[PDB]
Amino acid sequence: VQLQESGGGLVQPGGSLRLSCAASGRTISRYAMSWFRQAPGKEREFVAVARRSGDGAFYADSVQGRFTVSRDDAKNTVYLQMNSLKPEDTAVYYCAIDSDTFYSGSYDYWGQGTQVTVS
Amino acid sequence: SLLQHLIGL
Amino acid sequence: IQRTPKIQVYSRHSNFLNCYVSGFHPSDIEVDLLKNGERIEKVEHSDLSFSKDWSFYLLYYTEFTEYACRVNHVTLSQPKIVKWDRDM
Amino acid sequence: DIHMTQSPSSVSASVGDRVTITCRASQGISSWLAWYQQKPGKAPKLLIYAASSLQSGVPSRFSGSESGTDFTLTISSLQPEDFATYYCQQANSFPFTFGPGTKVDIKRTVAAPSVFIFPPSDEQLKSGTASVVCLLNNFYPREAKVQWKVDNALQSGNSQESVTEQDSKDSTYSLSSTLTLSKADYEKHKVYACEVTHQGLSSPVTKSFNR
Amino acid sequence: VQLQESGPGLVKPSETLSLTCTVSGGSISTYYWSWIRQPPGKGLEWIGYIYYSGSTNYNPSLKSRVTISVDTSKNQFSLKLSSVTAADMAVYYCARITEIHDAFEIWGQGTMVTVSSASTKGPSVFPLAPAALGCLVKDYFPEPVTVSWNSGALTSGVHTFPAVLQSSGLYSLSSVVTVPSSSLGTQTYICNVNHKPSNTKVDKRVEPK
Amino acid sequence: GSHSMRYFFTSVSRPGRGEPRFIAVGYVDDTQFVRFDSDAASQRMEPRAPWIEQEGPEYWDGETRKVKAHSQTHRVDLGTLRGYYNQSEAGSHTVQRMYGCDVGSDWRFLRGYHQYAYDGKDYIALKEDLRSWTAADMAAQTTKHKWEAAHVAEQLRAYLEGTCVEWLRRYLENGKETLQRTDAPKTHMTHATLRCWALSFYPAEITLTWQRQDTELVETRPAGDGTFQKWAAVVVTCHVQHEGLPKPLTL
């Protein structure tokens, strides 16, 4: 499975943006989708998870309320409708596949990541 | 009085 | 599975005009008591019950003093008007 | 018998949320479907019978529907007392069959587990047995995996796990994995570790100690 | 009504499992009185129901092993499983079937029946030295053991996990506290384990090693 | 004489018009004393007799609780029978259930009834022995095995020989003025065609014959006041047998 990131750029504080992530290869219908964030000079930080249709979505705390994650199994794409942007949320966002039907957080394939700069 | 205990077909 | 309604228009003895439709199937029936061809609004009906052959019967009654009873059923192609005969 | 299925297995929700739980049947079961609520340690409580009717005393926020070969349990305006496990039971043909059960949790921000490992005590090593305990603390959601590894070798069968019940203060879970070895087998290995994977972690976290 | 199970919780393997469910607040009457077992961790399984006349409808999966009886004189119906193996270890609920024979309306409190040929054993408590510290209550029979930290204090960060059934038939649970690392030396930590059936009271002090 | 307490239940599936139209009607001989229309605003077991009003709460609350159990059973049974016969979902079908108990001059149990129907055709019935079932078609054999696993006949026999008889006796005592009444028909003739009018008789069990014979007789019909009426005609002696006349009446 190949995951590609696109849909970032530079935003003003308080704005909005929607990341896209195309899933090339298998069809993402049983594997939950994830979003992350790695700041410069910092480790990765969980942001949001999109699970199978009907299994709900979960978000971290620095992104809750303002962020919402969507998935499109037919188009093999996941949309991160991240609104209310602030300068803190300035880092590359990733895509992680959950190759575990039981939702054990088995992230094997990862996207390239697209930088999301707020200024 | 009505039959208290019923069962489906 | 459909049986045509057996229609009876009669009075108890002011008065009451009963339109007894029995032996029909299914239960969905349209009984409209007519006064000189005009439907009577103050018409009451009994509770739907069936017989031992599973055929339904209903009693539509109204207070009255040329009356008839127009009943429409699935079996009947067109509404059937049975005049209220005082000798029947 | 008629095997019964439920969807989804778990529903993480919050207070005021609308919760939908789906049930299915292997064969046609007409509309003879019942819904139960069961809190841990208590007997199940019937909510909806015949796929649409509400049991007396059950709050009106619980609703059931059936479209075709499918049944739905709805909780509009979820309340703090509605977090439990829900079962669908068929009664079209004997025997009575229950569904697998769907658990509804109190949703919260994702928390990665804190992993602590515990070497076996010396007083236990003198009894001819050794036990290694790996602790997973304060993680959400419940779905976490702990794999035991000694000398970089995965194990199976010789481990047991226990999970808490979503501590009411922060609505997080806790897990403990026990590795039951023998005094002879324990002394034959140097490094003992547990690998933990969770949806809150981008990479697995391993806690290890040296004998 | 109120339903209460009155059966022994320890049945030896390959022996007859006798459970009695008393009915309070009413009578056996014409209701169908079912036996439902929910094994720990899995869903509910229906054993069968008894009518007051003794006519019972068994689950065909265990029809040959299950004997369900009714004692309407004493308002109690009984379950008599035979040749009981470890697969019969479950929480046995006695319930009343709904008046349209489709659900179970009134339930009993439930009784946990343990299938094990193990005698009563004392809990051997072992410390879990460090952060997080605890003590492991290993190889005790039967359940339960109550673990408390510093008598009645230390109610924050305490995680007492449910006990597991080992391969030898003896239970085991672990209790862990999450005290701050700044009080490891100044503050002492002792976990008190109380097993009433074994008349065992162990106060093990957990210190860093 | 003999008495019975029949209970007639009708549920008609409405395609796209909501829940099935369930009408529950309780009968003691030829007197309806209770009713339940699911489309009514009351949503209770409406009393249809003056004597049944003498019973207050904790009886209507119980009758209502059991009649919505019949409504829920019949609504689901409509979908079970639609799948048995592989029918479309856009049609309107009917399920009819009749159960009751007969008694004698001693008011002891005489006979028990429990029959089902689908679209006016017999589906299942309790045999006279009250232990076995007479399934009509192969679709009713599926019901037979399920109802024999559950010992439904034994529960039904317990109701029919037990609760039904004791409740009918209570009804026969609560409503002794009306349930135990017996009115001789007011037979009179009209004027070719000769027709005799049997008027205002209870119970509905009547017999009319002509002897000097290709007669023209109609079904007995409800007059609406708790009585019945009937007539027979022959184109050109009218004999009537009713419980209100110990001796035969010739017109």
TrEMBL record, chain F:
Keywords: Disulfide bond, Glycoprotein, Immunity, Membrane, MHC I, Phosphoprotein, Signal, Transmembrane, Transmembrane helix. GO terms for biological process: antigen processing and presentation of peptide antigen via MHC class I. It comes from Homo sapiens (Human). InterPro entries: Ig-like_dom (IPR007110), Ig-like_dom_sf (IPR036179), Ig-like_fold (IPR013783), Ig/MHC_CS (IPR003006), Ig_C1-set (IPR003597), MHC_class-I_related (IPR050208), MHC_I-like_Ag-recog (IPR011161), MHC_I-like_Ag-recog_sf (IPR037055). Residues 185-250 form the Ig-like domain. The gene is HLA-A. Its main location: membrane. Disulfide bonds join C101-C164, C196-C238. GO terms for cellular component: early endosome membrane; ER to Golgi transport vesicle membrane; Golgi membrane; lumenal side of endoplasmic reticulum membrane; MHC class I protein complex; phagocytic vesicle membrane; recycling endosome membrane. This is MHC class I antigen. PANTHER family: HLA CLASS I HISTOCOMPATIBILITY ANTIGEN, A ALPHA CHAIN (PTHR16675:SF229), MHC CLASS I-RELATED (PTHR16675). It is found in: Cell membrane; Membrane. The lineage of its organism: Eukaryota, Metazoa, Chordata, Craniata, Vertebrata.
